[PDB]
């Protein structure tokens, strides 16, 4: 290990705990929290294996009188919450972290749906949510804020039963009663917590004084924000985490911060910026990234892409995904794990046809279980849709998912690699080989059935009519100033305005067209969706909300409102049509079709996976691959689940 | 007398239900996040005399899920338990006990379990939120699994105590549905095709559960009455022949609507029976009875249906939740006393945020396990005697009904000549004429009270509450709508042109405005985002006036999406000659306009009116509560022991909140002091070893 890294693994002082070195993984959720708590506590373990310094939970409502399910965080109300919380606690210190537990209490943003209290803010006012609520919160009396610290102290009583060493307080992203007593928007109160930032800050100070008094022996305190709070609190926690210049300069307090390259982490460090590098994400698609560092094996660090695909899970209440880390989140359900492959079985050749995401992932995996692994690729470009996507605006940073891979399989004796080579299902059965992956893809369809049309729409052959697949493969002219393009959006998620942005470059006159009421509507599920119609609006797309196409005609597309059913025309010169796709399973038709041949040619098993199986995201065809390779030759398990998963405890 | 009709016994394949009235699948919010909970409140229907006790749907492997939804889970032996309880609850008191199961094929993106989703051809996921993940064509060797599954599941609820299995294939949700459909099965094999293949798997499904249980448990099937999808929907006529075709394949045939939307009808949108004419003449083509629901709470339409041969069963869900005791009530003859569903489906959005279903009408429900409420028995009495409850709206008209029937001496004191506060205003809006049950209801149950005494035309201050003496006070006083533009985009006051008309829906209520608004325009500034602003645009335009509705969301009435409210408010808004701005909030209220901005980009623009009708939110009258705090020193020895607020004067909400505070204070008064503890029990997840 180089020694500018060095500075990176000094011992850290947080209250009355020494952290081992400055890797912080700071509070992020997982979509398991208090449902699915084995799943999250065996994940933290891995974060702790993986040599992070400080780990910390998801935030943990502390109290029944603010939550804001249908989210499903983590749960401090009572002594029942409490194994739970412990196992995780337990799984963080094996390897030496300290065990962080983040307490909030959401305030002004929590509906109180499942509990149906009463809300509470400092003033009164309605419920602030991504949906629109309709509840307003009741302005705390003086009583409440006696009443809230003390429940903040029973949760950080409670956080020491449960084993955690460190209480943070969410304070950041206006999320949370601590943000809202600060804010002079949320906090119009003219009593002593109200007015001046030194009454805007009381409650924090409150809180902070009340839990150190507490459990200030055994536990440090962490205040989480997202700034004069600066100079009259410099030194009220035992750390600061930053979600700086006078931080640094007035308190003598150790400070975190996030941002998603060691030069850079130790830089930070050396300059006196930061005593904690934080990470979420970086340890989500990485969770060894502090032991590779530590070992001098920066060339093996597994990059984030920033697709946020995580952050779906939290807002689909479903357990995260990780593109680049499928083991993400399945190390307790499956048995997965991030720098470990289960033991090879008794066959020894695999055949892997397609290198996109899935057949490289299926490839690097398998490898690493000790197969002898042949991968045949049709085209002259490891990466398949990947390596057409990141040329498209705004999507380089995909193309990590491809080079992880690449560069890893590189590195194997056991992987060949053949291009040009289009497989047929007799080239398949002349190599072989024992047991064969059929990663071949999808095609975006012509035909216009994605979800509003079923079966193929009219369409006027005498329109021209590009599919992403033609924009990426350059179909379409380079310059199309003078012309309009109908930008038909059907799928939802981020190619239609990709798509947009293409054609918008391009010169052309852009419309695009959703049926739904917000433009790539799923993209609010990674929180990008706002800056998305921005953008198309800054380059002078003309989004048409609301409205389906239902025919394509010789000059013009017929559109639909798509709640009255009325309808108009758009005229156009092209249509890019963003449906949806169709697998390219030919090839494992055709061996199919021939299963009676793989026997004397030595073929054990055929399988089809990724986009040729069932189209979707890009992390699920890196997660198909990596299933391919944890299952091979393992047992058949009948009607038995693949993966562990916990049930409600009856109570008595 | 006329009802008798409705407590004749029906065979179900091998069971006999004792009577007619038959509660269909439904959710609670609840499922396998809270199973006692679920339990306990289908132990109240066994308690209130249904026939038939359902589940919710049953998700019946793991390859077909629906999460975030929480139904309910049926894929390994662990689920069990939890069923068992459900189970047993429907059956202590003579209900048939019914378990739905579910397979929702091209309806399940499998978020959670990340298997790859299944259906009858290769299809995006079609659901309410665009979800970017396709299904993928079932092979033979996957419907042979799929058949299998079916069997496990139904031995998995024979173990679990379930009398009769319904498969569910209505509101075009799942498989079943999916295969008959022609726009979702564009097969070629001999699962596709003609009528006689679409409907292949159904009959091969049912023969394979029979042959497991079919001698302790009988099949029903939910079907979808009417789809369309372009030229291909599995039309009403369809269904007629698949019925007539199968006319002995299940042991009942449970219709309901090919959309939730259509099937739980808004009463805003749809009255009683709405659905008889899509199942008029089906008992005719199937010797099997016949189930079928329309927001059923009139008796005399309920004998009706079954007198002129639509129905076998009165199916409800909406009406047993809103009254879990409706079968004993019109079994007794107290037809007076039935707490009829109002129809504002606040019940569904706890489904939709998956969050323990509440009722307008019914605050018991699925409260029942959590706190020990009943909707027909109250807490005794406690160690005092006497309450005022000041304000009879929702909250006070509640408590007030629920505390006599725990014994106390009521007094309730009403500032107007009227009970019902918002309720009796807001029942006078177009399409909200059915939310009036919420004064009506209450007002009868006091009218037979002895021990409650109520004052009108009394506006008490804190000086007339201390004067009276009485032990307990509950201020039930209520909200006003604000004029200041507060409520989301604003959070201070927003620039307001004194010169410019601004009214409040209280204003409108009120009836401040001409009666005739031709020749005007209104600008309505809808920043509520629930129902009230589209309320008023209605009013306006039915006016005259030139209505143009301007709201930050991208959707009219945002939160009606969670009562299915939503598309049928705009297509009537539409239909209004409403003009409907999305994505844009006021900023400003000037002379003759409205100063607008797009929400994403800022950019801002002017709205010429004559008006601005402004729907932000509300602020509580809490003076009187106040006054009494401040004064807390004089309460001893003026007798007074404790003083609340509730309801809207709390912290306003809708209708469902303030009867639910209205029952908590009644529940609550004289309770021990639990300190922290929790008011409620909750369950956890069991932890692995
Ligand atoms: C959820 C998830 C899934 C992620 C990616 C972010 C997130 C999540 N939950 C959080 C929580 O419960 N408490 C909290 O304080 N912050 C939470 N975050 C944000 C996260 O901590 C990081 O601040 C961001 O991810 C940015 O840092 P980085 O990811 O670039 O390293
Ligand atoms: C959930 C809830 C909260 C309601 C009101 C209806 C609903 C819900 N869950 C259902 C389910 O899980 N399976 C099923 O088959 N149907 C479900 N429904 C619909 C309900 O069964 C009724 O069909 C409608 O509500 C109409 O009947 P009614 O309420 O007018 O009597
Ligand atoms: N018959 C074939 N033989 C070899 N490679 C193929 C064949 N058919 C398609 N391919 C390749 O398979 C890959 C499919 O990858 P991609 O579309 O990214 O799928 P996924 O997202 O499922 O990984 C492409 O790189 C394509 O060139
Ligand atoms: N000082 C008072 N004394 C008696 N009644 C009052 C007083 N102030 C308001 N009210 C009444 O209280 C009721 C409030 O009802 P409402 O606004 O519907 O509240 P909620 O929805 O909380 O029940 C109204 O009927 C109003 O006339
Ligand atoms: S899902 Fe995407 S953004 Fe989130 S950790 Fe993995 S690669 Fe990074
Ligand atoms: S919430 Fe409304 S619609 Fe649902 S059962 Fe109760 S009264 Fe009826």
New interface residues.
Partial sequence: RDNKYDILFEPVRIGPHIAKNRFYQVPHCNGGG?????AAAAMRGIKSEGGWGVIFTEQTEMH?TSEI??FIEL?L??D??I??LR?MSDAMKVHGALAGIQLAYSGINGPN????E??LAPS???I?TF????????ALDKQDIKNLR??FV?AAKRSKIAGFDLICLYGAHGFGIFQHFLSR??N?RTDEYGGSLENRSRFAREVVEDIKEAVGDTTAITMRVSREFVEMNANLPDLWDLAVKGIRELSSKPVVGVGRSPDVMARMVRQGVLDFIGCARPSIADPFLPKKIEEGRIEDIRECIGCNICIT?DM????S?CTQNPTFMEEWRKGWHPERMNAKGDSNTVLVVGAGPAGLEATRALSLRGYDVTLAEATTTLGGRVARERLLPGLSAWGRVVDYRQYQISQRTNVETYFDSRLTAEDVLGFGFEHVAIATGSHWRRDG???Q???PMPIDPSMTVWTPDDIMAKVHPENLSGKTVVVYDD???YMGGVMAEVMAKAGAKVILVTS???VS??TRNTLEQ?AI??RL?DLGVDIR??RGVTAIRAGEVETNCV??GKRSAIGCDAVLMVA????EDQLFNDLIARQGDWPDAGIKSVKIIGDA?????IA?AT??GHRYARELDTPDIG?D?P?????????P
């Fill in positions: 208090y449902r699915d708590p084995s029944h399910t249908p749960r109300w009572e029942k919450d194994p739970g196992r749906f499942y509990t149906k009463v809300p009164a006012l309605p602030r949906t629109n609520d309709p509840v307003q919160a009741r003390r429940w029973n928007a949320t119009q899970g689909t209440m479903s357990i995904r059935v994605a979800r049309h079923v079966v799928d939802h998620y739904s009421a917000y509507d799923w706002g119609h921005v609006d909300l609301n709640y009255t949806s796709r169709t697998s199986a069932a189209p979707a995201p699920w997660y198909a009607d689940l993966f562990r998963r916990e049930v409600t405890q009856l109570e």
